[PDB]
Amino acid sequence: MAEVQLVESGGGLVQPGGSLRLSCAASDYIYRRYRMGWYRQAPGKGREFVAAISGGSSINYADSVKGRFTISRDNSKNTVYLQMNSLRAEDTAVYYCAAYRIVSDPRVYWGQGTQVTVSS
């Protein structure tokens, strides 16, 4: 059998113009072959794409974060990072890591989310 685990950290409270760095640590099964993405959801709104990496396609960013957020990964730690710069109040949301491999797995795996609050 294989273990599936996604662990997010790095959320917190900052002011407009501030910055954060989120991390998503994945089990080996997931990290070696799945596309890994960040999504976010504010209360009352739908969940939306932020950025993604790996899984056989190139890095992709949502329009609303291009140039301000940067996704990367460290194979020695099985971890994906989201460097978040120039934060705006409208970036306030729960940020979720997700893993998906649509050619071979009918399941999307989600972390439980980390809260990002941008408030003056």
Residue numbers in the entry: -1 to 118
Quoted passage from the original study:
AT118i4h32 is a nanobody antagonist for the angiotensin II type 1 receptor (AT1R), a G protein-coupled receptor (GPCR) that is a central regulator of blood pressure and renal function. AT118i4h32 directly competes with the binding of small molecule and peptide ligands to the AT1R and is active in vivo, reducing mouse blood pressure to a comparable degree as the clinically used angiotensin receptor blocker losartan. We demonstrate successful use of our software on three polyreactive nanobodies, including AT118i4h32, a nanobody antagonist of the angiotensin II type I receptor (AT1R), where we reduce polyreactivity without compromising binding affinity or target-specific pharmacology. Synthetic nanobodies provide an ideal reductionist system to probe polyreactivity in the context of a fixed framework without the influence of heavy and light chain pairing effects.
To investigate how the G26D27 T57I65 substitutions alter AT118i4h32’s structure and contribute to reduce polyreactivity, we crystallized AT118i4h32 G26D27 T57I65 and solved the structure at 1.6 Å resolution. The T57I65 substitution is located at the end of CDR2. I5765 forms more favorable hydrophobic interactions with neighboring I5156 and I65 side chains than T5765. In the case of AT118i4h32, maintaining this hydrophobic interaction is essential for antigen recognition, as the T57D65 substitution diminished AT1R binding two-fold. While the T57I65 mildly decreases polyreactivity, AT118i4h32 variants containing the T57I65 substitutions had slightly decreased thermal stability, indicating that reduced polyreactivity is not necessarily correlated with thermal stability. Residue D2627, found at the N-terminus of helical CDR1, forms a hydrogen bond with the side chain of framework residue N76 in all eight copies of the nanobody in the crystal structure’s asymmetric unit. This hydrogen bond rigidifies the CDR1 position and may reduce the flexibility of the nanobody’s CDR regions. Additionally, the G26D27 substitution improves AT118i4h32’s stability; we observed a five-fold increase in AT118i4h32 G26D27 yield from E. coli and a two-degree increase in melting temperature of the G26D27 variant over wild-type levels. Two AT118i4h32 variants, G26D27 and T57I65, retained at least 80% of wild-type binding levels to the AT1R. AT118i4h32 variants containing G26D27 and T57I65 maintain affinity for AT1R and the ability to act as receptor antagonists, displacing small molecule orthosteric antagonists and suppressing receptor signaling upon angiotensin II (AngII) stimulation.
